[PDB]
Design an enzyme around this catalytic site. Structure first.
Site, PDB file in Angstrom:
ATOM      1  CG  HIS A 321      -2.052   0.861   0.899  1.00 53.02           C
ATOM      2  ND1 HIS A 321      -3.340   0.643   0.566  1.00 53.02           N
ATOM      3  CD2 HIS A 321      -2.147   2.434   1.240  1.00 53.02           C
ATOM      4  CE1 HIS A 321      -3.798   1.953   0.604  1.00 53.02           C
ATOM      5  NE2 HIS A 321      -3.297   2.962   0.817  1.00 53.02           N
ATOM      6  CB  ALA A 322       1.006   4.066  -2.458  1.00 56.72           C
ATOM      7  CG  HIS A 351      -2.253  10.786  -2.934  1.00 55.77           C
ATOM      8  ND1 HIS A 351      -3.649  11.527  -2.824  1.00 55.77           N
ATOM      9  CD2 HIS A 351      -2.057  10.157  -1.850  1.00 55.77           C
ATOM     10  CE1 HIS A 351      -3.908  11.174  -1.292  1.00 55.77           C
ATOM     11  NE2 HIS A 351      -2.558  10.354  -0.823  1.00 55.77           N
ATOM     12  CD  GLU A 352       1.089   7.929  -1.913  1.00 60.67           C
ATOM     13  OE1 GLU A 352       1.633   8.491  -0.856  1.00 60.67           O
ATOM     14  OE2 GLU A 352       0.110   7.362  -2.185  1.00 60.67           O
ATOM     15  CG  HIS A 355       1.179  12.706   1.602  1.00 58.52           C
ATOM     16  ND1 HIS A 355       0.216  13.246   2.563  1.00 58.52           N
ATOM     17  CD2 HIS A 355       0.259  11.655   1.235  1.00 58.52           C
ATOM     18  CE1 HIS A 355      -0.930  12.617   2.461  1.00 58.52           C
ATOM     19  NE2 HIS A 355      -0.788  11.543   1.711  1.00 58.52           N
ATOM     20  CD  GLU A 379      -4.161  11.665   3.037  1.00 58.56           C
ATOM     21  OE1 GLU A 379      -4.059  11.333   1.790  1.00 58.56           O
ATOM     22  OE2 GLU A 379      -3.231  11.121   3.920  1.00 58.56           O
ATOM     23  CG  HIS A 481      -6.655   3.384   5.155  1.00 62.20           C
ATOM     24  ND1 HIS A 481      -6.502   2.817   3.738  1.00 62.20           N
ATOM     25  CD2 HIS A 481      -5.892   4.487   4.795  1.00 62.20           C
ATOM     26  CE1 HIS A 481      -5.843   3.763   3.011  1.00 62.20           C
ATOM     27  NE2 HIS A 481      -5.627   4.756   3.683  1.00 62.20           N
ATOM     28  CE1 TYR A 491      -6.197   8.949   2.258  1.00 67.82           C
ATOM     29  CE2 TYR A 491      -7.024   7.839   4.034  1.00 67.82           C
ATOM     30  CZ  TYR A 491      -6.000   7.942   3.301  1.00 67.82           C
ATOM     31  OH  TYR A 491      -4.622   7.470   3.473  1.00 67.82           O
TER      32      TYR A 491
HETATM   33  C1  RX4 Z   1       3.861   7.709   7.411  1.00 71.26           C
HETATM   34  C2  RX4 Z   1       2.669   8.399   7.049  1.00 71.26           C
HETATM   35  O1  RX4 Z   1       1.729   8.353   8.211  1.00 71.26           O
HETATM   36  N1  RX4 Z   1       2.721   8.653   5.871  1.00 71.26           N
HETATM   37  C3  RX4 Z   1       1.141   9.275   5.158  1.00 71.26           C
HETATM   38  C4  RX4 Z   1       1.506  10.758   4.723  1.00 71.26           C
HETATM   39  C5  RX4 Z   1       1.245  11.580   5.953  1.00 71.26           C
HETATM   40  O2  RX4 Z   1       0.181  11.619   6.459  1.00 71.26           O
HETATM   41  O3  RX4 Z   1       2.208  12.279   6.143  1.00 71.26           O
HETATM   42  C6  RX4 Z   1       0.921   8.219   4.079  1.00 71.26           C
HETATM   43  O4  RX4 Z   1       1.856   7.780   3.771  1.00 71.26           O
HETATM   44  N2  RX4 Z   1      -0.317   7.994   3.794  1.00 71.26           N
HETATM   45  C7  RX4 Z   1      -0.737   7.016   2.824  1.00 71.26           C
HETATM   46  C8  RX4 Z   1      -1.683   5.845   3.691  1.00 71.26           C
HETATM   47  C9  RX4 Z   1      -0.715   5.407   4.808  1.00 71.26           C
HETATM   48  C10 RX4 Z   1      -1.274   5.952   6.175  1.00 71.26           C
HETATM   49  C11 RX4 Z   1      -0.356   5.917   7.348  1.00 71.26           C
HETATM   50  C12 RX4 Z   1       0.636   4.985   7.239  1.00 71.26           C
HETATM   51  C13 RX4 Z   1       0.967   4.233   5.958  1.00 71.26           C
HETATM   52  C14 RX4 Z   1       0.193   4.411   4.944  1.00 71.26           C
HETATM   53  P1  RX4 Z   1      -1.524   7.643   1.405  1.00 71.26           P
HETATM   54  O5  RX4 Z   1      -2.807   8.495   1.623  1.00 71.26           O
HETATM   55  O6  RX4 Z   1      -0.619   8.447   0.672  1.00 71.26           O
HETATM   56  C15 RX4 Z   1      -1.907   6.261   0.361  1.00 71.26           C
HETATM   57  C16 RX4 Z   1      -2.975   6.642  -0.699  1.00 71.26           C
HETATM   58  C17 RX4 Z   1      -2.922   5.345  -1.986  1.00 71.26           C
HETATM   59  C18 RX4 Z   1      -4.329   6.162   0.072  1.00 71.26           C
HETATM   60  O7  RX4 Z   1      -4.471   5.646   0.739  1.00 71.26           O
HETATM   61  N3  RX4 Z   1      -5.578   6.671  -0.541  1.00 71.26           N
HETATM   62  C19 RX4 Z   1      -6.902   6.431   0.078  1.00 71.26           C
HETATM   63  C20 RX4 Z   1      -7.839   7.157  -0.829  1.00 71.26           C
HETATM   64  C21 RX4 Z   1      -7.196   4.884  -0.653  1.00 71.26           C
HETATM   65  N4  RX4 Z   1      -7.834   4.176   0.236  1.00 71.26           N
HETATM   66  O8  RX4 Z   1      -6.402   4.422  -1.512  1.00 71.26           O
HETATM   67 ZN    ZN Z   2      -2.368  10.237   1.133  1.00 73.62          ZN
END
Ligand code: RX4
Ligand code: ZN
Ligand SMILES: *[C@@H]1O[C@H](CO)[C@@H](O[C@@H]2O[C@H](CO)[C@@H](O[C@@H]3O[C@H](CO[C@H]4O[C@H](CO)[C@@H](O)[C@H](O)[C@@H]4O)[C@@H](O)[C@H](O[C@H]4O[C@H](CO[C@@H]5O[C@H](CO)[C@@H](O)[C@H](O)[C@@H]5O)[C@@H](O)[C@H](O)[C@@H]4O)[C@@H]3O)[C@H](O)[C@H]2NC(C)=O)[C@H](O)[C@H]1NC(C)=O
Ligand code: NAG
Ligand code: NAG
Length: 598
Positions: A321-322, A351-352, A355, A379, A481, A491
């Protein structure tokens, strides 16, 4: 006396912030190692460093009582001290904190390691969610094949972790109460600094819900034409495995089957990316160009040196998961993404990178302020650019969309395609947290936890499992999540405010004027816009130094989260769709699902 103490407190915070950034660096490196390479040894190392930082934060929260911080003149110093009192899980007794950590890693490693057997070859048992199972769900139109993968996946990622999930709810509740919140719901909501936040989201959701019902009705009608009425009924919830996504959270993979004007272009640039020889590295350079094109910050060398941007070749376990990672130094930021060369993945790269940008923008703030104005701002950043990149305007500039004629029909196809991601997701995201909030709050008896999940997905999204489930299954942790304990309201908030940010950035760029047919919101490209980048710099550079309405104000002068912008973007689609559903006598709404037996 207080004047002298406040001078002493300012030096105390300046040093403590630096110490926290440094101790958090070490904890983050361990969490990164484990997510990159799941092993018993890296688990131990992650959880042991965390326990050590938790002990230190207990000391910090205790030492804040030596300062009369609520009596100070400086709102900024009071805001910093208030941030340090908030221990979260670290408020737990040593042993309960270690137990909670072992619980979290058991769940997230369970998720990351799921594998299933090929539908056609029971001998081949190494299909992972990413990419093998997601490839079938997004592409197969064999409804029995789809149901097979749905059930194998949910049974392994969801049900297998029910007892760990139960213990996590107990310790999460115990922690929240040691912080004197009623439950983990209130602890999560505290990040928004607004005691009417839930009500505000109900009100916005209520305004957009009628549009969702229209899209839901039209999609069900189109799916009946494709699969027939033995598979999809006119009046019931849509069988979720047909919607092109394992959690039915976005429906854009079935656009080729539900698009309003099938004889007109529908944007899907994956095949042109492959034909042009795109790689993960090029897509990330692409994203980097876009932020630098707006006068924002270039990715630093450590990002290129240390990011993981394709799924490892070796046979090692890890979390695909990204994710995007701030190491709390200077320019030490990274992404871990199992990059695939597809249109949706081009949006995920941006998206990434959004952040990463916010990390670089706020890295000069004291450590407590190095986070988003509220979690939804973090986000939204990259999705503002993704909204621009997805436009036929942009995609023609980069040579990915050829021979496109943007007539009224193509415009409707494109708006509908965008809606299958952005409007469809709203009820989905709301339910991820309404579900966990109602467990945290003690509102659902453990005997009813599975059907409580499916009852929300039915009531809000009008979708249901492909097969009958019961309290013998436990499906919620099948969503990353939920197994990884990541709050989801960020989100829902993002999908609403990212339109406020896009609309304002498009206006600043000269790309949107509501009175000019040649500048519609849904074909705005903010690429190359310094004016849009300035507004981003002004907001992101604040981190969490001020309450989020001040950060929104720094961007566009407004202070209120509002669904006006998302409704304005979709208003041409709403007019067309309401009329098209009447024209076709399309049934709207759904009867209560039969798919979860109490
Ligand atoms: C280390 C951390 O918390 N990084 C966050 C960014 C931030 O809040 O600083 C992140 O990677 N957050 C990711 C999800 C994640 C959350 C917590 C830990 C591991 C992964 P993301 O939001 O970039 C992943 C992205 C593909 C996502 O989940 N989108 C939603 C809409 C989904 N369900 O796919
Ligand atoms: Zn994100
Ligand atoms: C969540 O809420 C909890 C309450 O539900 C809260 O727990 C309370 O925190 C208080 C600490 O702020 C704590 O207060 C102390 O109580 C001491 C004695 O209590 C014992 O008997 C209790 C009941 O009678 C038992 O339940 C306890 O378990 C105890 O064993 C007092 O001795 C103590 O006093 C000292 O401190 C006060 C406060 O001083 C402040 O700072 C300056 C100092 O410069 C003062 O001048 C200033 O005005 C301010 O008062 C002094 O005035 C005094 O002289 C002593 O030095 C203090 O009152 C309370 O016991 C505790 N529990 C309960 C049930 O009340 C948690 O802290 C909350 N958690 C979070 C994270 O916010
Ligand atoms: C994964 O971790 C193990 C020890 O837990 C380590 O020996 C190994 O080098 C790591 N693998 C990779 C590919 O980094
Ligand atoms: C680029 O950004 C900086 C601030 O980071 C600003 O001072 C400079 O004037 C900006 N460039 C343009 C073209 O506006």
């Amino acid at each position: 006396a207080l004047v002298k103490e406040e001078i002493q407190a300012k030096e105390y915070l300046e040093n403590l912030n630096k110490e926290l950034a440094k101790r958090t660096n070490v904890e983050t490196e361990a969490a990164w190692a484990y997510g990159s390479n799941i092993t018993d040894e890296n688990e131990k190392k992650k959880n042991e460093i965390s326990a050590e930082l938790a002990k230190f934060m207990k000391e910090v929260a205790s030492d804040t009582t030596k300062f009369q911080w609520r009596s100070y003149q400086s709102e900024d110093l009071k805001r910093q001290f208030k941030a340090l009192t908030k221990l979260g899980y670290a408020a737990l007794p040593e042993d309960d904190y270690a137990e909670l950590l072992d619980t979290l890693s058991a769940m997230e490693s369970n998720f990351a390691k799921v594998k299933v057997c090929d539908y056609k070859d029971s001998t081949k048992c190494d299909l992972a969610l990413d990419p093998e199972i997601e490839e079938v769900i997004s592409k197969s139109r064999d409804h029995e094949e789809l149901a097979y993968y749905w059930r194998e996946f949910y049974d392994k990622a969801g049900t297998a972790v029910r007892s760990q999930f139960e213990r996590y709810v107990e310790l999460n509740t115990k922690a929240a109460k040691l912080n004197n919140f009623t439950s983990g719901a209130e602890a999560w909501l505290d990040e928004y600094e607004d005691d009417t936040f839930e009500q505000q989201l109900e009100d916005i959701f209520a305004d957009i819900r009628p549009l969702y019902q229209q899209i839901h009705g039209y999609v069900r009608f189109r799916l009946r034409k494709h699969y027939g009425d033995a598979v999809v009924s006119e009046t019931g919830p849509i069988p979720m495995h047909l919607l092109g996504n394992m959690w039915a959270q976005q429906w854009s993979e079935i656009a080729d089957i539900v698009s309003p004007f099938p004889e007109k272009p529908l944007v899907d640039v994956s095949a042109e990316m492959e034909k042009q020889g795109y790689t993960p590295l090029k897509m990330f350079q692409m994203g980097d160009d876009f932020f630098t094109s707006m006068n924002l910050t270039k990715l630093p060398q450590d990002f290129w040196d240390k990011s993981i941007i394709e799924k490892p070749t070796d046979g090692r376990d890890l979390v695909c998961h990204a994710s995007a990672w701030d190491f709390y130094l200077t320019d030490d930021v990274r992404i871990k993404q199992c990059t695939r060369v597809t249109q949706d993945q081009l949006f995920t790269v941006h998206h990434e990178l959004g952040h990463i940008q916010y990390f670089l923008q706020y890295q000069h703030q004291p450590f407590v302020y190095r986070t988003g104005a509220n979690p939804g701002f973090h986000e939204a950043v990259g999705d503002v650019l993704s909204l621009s990149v997805s436009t036929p305007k942009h995609l023609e500039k980069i040579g990915l969309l050829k021979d496109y004629v943007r007539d009224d029909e193509a415009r409707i196809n494109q708006l509908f395609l965008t809606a299958l991601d952005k409007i469809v997701f709203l009820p989905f995201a709301f339910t991820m947290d309404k579900y966990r909030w109602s467990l945290f709050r003690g509102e659902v008896d453990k005997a009813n936890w599975n059907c409580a999940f499916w009852k929300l997905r039915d009531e809000y999204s009008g979708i249901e499992p492909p097969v009958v489930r019961s309290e013998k299954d436990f499906d919620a942790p099948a969503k990353y999540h939920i197994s990884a304990d990541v709050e989801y309201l960020r989100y829902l908030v993002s999908f609403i405010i990212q339109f406020q940010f896009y609309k304002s950035a498009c206006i600043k760029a000269g790309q949107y004027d509501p009175d000019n047919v040649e500048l519609p919101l849904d074909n705005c490209d903010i690429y190359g816009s310094a004016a849009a980048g300035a507004a981003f710099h002004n907001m992101l550079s604040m981190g969490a130094s001020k309450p989020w309405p001040d950060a929104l104000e720094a961007f566009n002068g407004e202070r209120i989260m509002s669904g006006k912008a998302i409704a304005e973007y979709f208003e041409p689609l709403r007019v067309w769709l309401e009329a098209e559903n009447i024209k076709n006598n399309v049934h709207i709404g759904w009867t209560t699902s039969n798919k979860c037996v109490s």
